[PDB]
Design a protein around this ligand. Structure first.
Ligand SMILES: NC(=O)C[C@H](N)C(=O)O
Ligand SMILES: NC(=O)C[C@H](N)C(=O)O
Ligand SMILES: [Cl-]
Ligand SMILES: [Cl-]
Lengths: 366, 351
């Protein structure tokens, strides 16, 4: 019965010959520039570890640290501070360039190597028996930013990654401020790169990216801006102009931002979160808001292939982009289900229902 | 009405991911003894149905003349890691039936073992049909085709007599009518069945029950005798069923003949447990079957839940199950060696 559909039924499902294989619960929030909730799937206020979808907010703490401007970080450097890069050689090279700009060494990094986020890079590493190091971390440009901030204020580079360090005090404050949350409403764990990483309600992730895109609109319009809005507009512009620094070739974030060519930024969080800040457009206005928009997504079970499918389907349902823009993401939207002899064995479907109904139909966030 | 049963991973006490678990524990006739989630969930068994499909091969007239041995039969029940020793046995079995690799209708794929696949990548190796994790099963299907004079071209299509036999045999083992088993196409290009999750447990209860009756000298039909043979072959050659470091191999080695277990792609699992003090404490006087499906398809979580289930059920000693400790509580350690989180099992088995 379609007249009693509920948030708890918001799934992305794969099939084999029409028989259900796997299904994945979806949570999504679409918010305006003040964080007002416009559309939802699942539980839009789910307490969620943002993971690297929080890196642009952490990068604002770096950019607002007195003295950092003196180092001459350029837009590509700042995109790398916002990144989960593929450890391509240009990412490793830019990390070494940034270390030189602040006169630090790779031994000053407290993040660690891992297998590349790109299969193609990993394949090359395997052939050469290469063991990744700190400078290869997908979060290396962010760790260099944190080192830069520590040096700028005279705090010292030892322990920049620890919560008692002044840089982490600044990060924690800035994240809660961008979310419009009290400190006790943001929880903190330890990330794969060994930095504190925040958790907060999923819609406030959307809220951070609606503020990024709104700042981009204020800047493009020539409006006087606070130092913070100017810094948010700089982050937006850096990500959108250097999206390959944010991820890498073949990566969803890079292909999404190239496709939209300035109209939005997007960023992955590990274990299948996603965030998008959408500049004001005919599409946002048709959706019922006069400003910018933020979108945030979490796949409950952590599946990345399903995340990219769902995010792409969500952009289509919200009317964001053109069929031709979004067709650049078609391999993510409808993942190949082809067996070892080249026969198509099934596919992906999206039995979820965006909600903004009989008044008696309860939408219990689940 | 199924309850909400999850395995949950956390980072610092904060929920990261959660995975819905379905499980059925059944006795030798298939009566439901304990459950998680929806124990009758319609579920693609994938390679957890390989032993049942292998019974069709073993029951085919003339197949006994090829001289397949127990390790060979274990390969027919396998999702092996494409180790060089699995490749060699696939070629050996092709020689017993006078076939060649071109006769195979499965395709190569990245190895189920990460270590094997990195070895292949380092050497620019392109896997072929003989490397398929289901190669031994395909060689069995070729064997049955040749045995009845069916012709080896198209042994994998539903209208081939071998597939007619497989289709009929799966439903019989499940105790289902033909129309209660649904069929899709597998990664290896064979038909593959879907049926209620509890019937998967039932198949494996029948495997273990046949082993019990064989070990006791009982009046066994030809079918029970072959089910017993399948159980013995898997328990005696668990490295053919999977490979080094693989959960099924380590589970079966740990238990040393008391059970068999088998993985299904997209995170199904089946165990047939021979009658024991453990099963008697669980309230049944014969063998027992266990089947499990992680709704979202996560394998790490599957292995964790299966081992937690063995512990809840008291199957094995604590010493035996501690051999699976790395699967039971997967590592949650970051790139700098710091423990960042863990796995929890906030569910209760319902009886
Ligand atoms: N892209 C990511 O979310 C990576 C994550 N920040 C980590 O270090 O584990
Ligand atoms: N292990 C498996 O279930 C493999 C599966 N039978 C396939 O061919 O895709
Ligand atoms: Cl497939
Ligand atoms: Cl981690």
């Amino acid at each position: 019965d379609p007249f009693t559909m509920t948030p708890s039924e918001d799934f992305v499902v794969t099939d084999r010959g029409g028989i259900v294989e796997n299904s994945h619960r979806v949570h999504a929030a679409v918010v305006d520039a003040k964080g007002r909730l416009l559309y939802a799937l699942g539980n839009p206020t789910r307490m969620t570890l943002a993971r690297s979808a929080a890196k642009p907010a952490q990068a604002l703490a770096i950019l607002e640290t007195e003295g950092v401007a003196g180092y001459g970080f350029d837009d590509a450097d700042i995109a790398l501070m916002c990144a989960s890069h593929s450890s391509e050689d240009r990412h490793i090279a830019r990390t070494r360039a940034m270390l030189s700009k602040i006169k630090a060494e790779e031994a000053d990094l407290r993040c660690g190597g891992h297998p590349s986020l790109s299969e193609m890079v990993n394949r090359s590493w395997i052939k050469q028996d290469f063991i990744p190091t700190a400078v290869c971390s997908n979060c290396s440009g962010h760790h260099v930013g944190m080192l830069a901030g520590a040096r700028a204020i005279g705090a010292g580079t030892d322990g920049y990654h620890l919560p008692d360090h002044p840089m982490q005090g600044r990060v924690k404050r800035t994240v809660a401020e961008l979310c419009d949350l009290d400190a006790g409403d943001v929880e903190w764990g330890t990330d794969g790169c060994n930095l504190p990483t925040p958790a907060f309600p999923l819609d406030r992730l959307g809220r951070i990216y609606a503020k990024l895109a709104s700042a981009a609109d204020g800047s493009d319009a020539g409006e006087g801006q606070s130092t913070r809005c100017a810094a948010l507009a700089h982050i937006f512009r850096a990500m959108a102009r250097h999206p390959e620094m944010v991820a890498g070739e073949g990566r969803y974030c890079t292909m999404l931002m190239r496709a939209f060519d300035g109209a939005l930024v997007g960023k992955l969080g590990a274990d299948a979160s996603y965030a998008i800040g959408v500049r004001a457009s005919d599409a946002t206005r048709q959706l019922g808001t006069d400003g910018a928009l933020g979108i945030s997504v979490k796949i409950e079970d952590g599946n990345l292939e399903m995340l990219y499918a769902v995010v792409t389907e969500l952009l289509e349902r919200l009317g964001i982009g053109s069929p031709d823009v979004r067709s650049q993401l078609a391999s993510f939207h409808h993942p190949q289900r082809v067996n070892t002899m080249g026969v198509t064995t099934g596919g992906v479907s999206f039995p979820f229902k965006l909600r903004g109904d009989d008044p008696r139909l309860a939408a219990v966030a689940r």
